[PDB]
Amino acid sequence: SMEQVAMELRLTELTRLLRSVLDQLQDKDPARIFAQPVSLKEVPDYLDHIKHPMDFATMRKRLEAQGYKNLHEFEEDFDLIIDNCMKYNARDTVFYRAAVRLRDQGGVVLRQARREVDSIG
């Protein structure tokens, strides 16, 4: 149909917007602490602690498969990165502190992306 195609143009545009948003969030992690999944070779017990692991490479795979239907789903994944980190790592660690900074600096980006998604539809 002509409709399914119009839909597909929107999703493709959402994917385009979310790609830019993801790039902006990941620039707030210059140490690349959240770039890749936590290694299960190097942290073998990780899944006993964290039931739903997330990282920026994994979000990118989903993004490029146009696997995010709305901003809410995207945000859910970004919040997993931060929240997983703040549970697994203690307050006095470079990892916890990196998550706090990512959360705080990401808020600004996410606030404007919400306005843009509502605005552009």
Cα gyration radius (Å): 16 Å
For the sheet with most strands, the description reads: none
State the separation between the terminal residues, measured CA to CA. Answer: 21 Å
Strand percentage lies at: under 5%
State the CATH topology.
Answer: Histone Acetyltransferase, Chain A
Give the % helix. Answer: 55-70%
Q: So, CATH architecture?
A: Up-down Bundle
Query: What is the CATH homologous superfamily assignment?
Result: Bromodomain-like
Number of domains: 1
Q: How many runs of DSSP E, i.e. beta strands? A: 0
- Number of helices, where a helix is a run of at least 4 consecutive DSSP H or I residues: 5
Q: Please trace the helix and strand order, writing H or E for each element.
A: HHHHH
- Under CATH at level 1, the class stands as Mainly Alpha
**Shape call:** globular
Structural class per helix/strand content? Answer: mainly alpha
PDB class: gene regulation
Keywords: PanDDA, SGC - Diamond I04-1 fragment screening, bromodomain, epigenetics, XChemExplorer, gene regulation
Assembly: monomeric
Entry title: PanDDA analysis group deposition -- Crystal Structure of BRD1 after initial refinement with no ligand modelled (structure 203)
Describe the structure.
By secondary structure, the protein is an all-alpha fold. It has a single domain (1-121), classed as Histone Acetyltransferase, Chain A (Up-down Bundle). The chain has five helices and no strands. It has helices spanning 2-27, 46-49, 56-64, 71-88, 94-120. Helix 1 (2-27) runs antiparallel to helix 3, helix 1 runs antiparallel to helix 5 and helix 4 packs antiparallel against helix 5 (94-120). The protein starts with a helix and ends with a helix.
